[PDB]
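Our collaborator T.R. sent over the components below with a one-line note: 'Predict the complex.' Nothing else. No constraints on interfaces, no templates requested, no preferences about which chain binds where. So this is a plain run: every listed entity goes in together, and whatever single assembly comes back becomes the starting point for the next discussion.
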Amino acid sequence: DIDTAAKFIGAGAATVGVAGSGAGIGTVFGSLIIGYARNPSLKQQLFSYAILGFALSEAMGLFCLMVAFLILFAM
Amino acid sequence: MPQLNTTVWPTMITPMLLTLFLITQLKMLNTNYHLPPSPKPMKMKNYNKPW
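Returned assembly:
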């Protein structure tokens, strides 16, 4: 059906939006590497922020996948 | 999507409201941290030598 078809298309489209989270975690962990290479005494503390940074990047990524499934199954 | 089943929402809301605001808060309130023992080796109200 055209409905089911458009569900598949919109699912793939909404899935595209995970590239943002991919690049976001890339940047976060790259910056963590640099910041640790500079001031290693703060490693522990720095790591904390990293996780938090990560925890929000994946956040947005999640929303994408959300619509994906919320179109694939709930609609 | 089962999350959207608005029929069974209160059976999730109520026990959470009970355990997050009453039980857990109590189990915390029982956990107390006494101030550290501070034996004061300087406390002596000795009046001026009588004189």
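Summary for T.R.: Chain A has one domain: 2-73.
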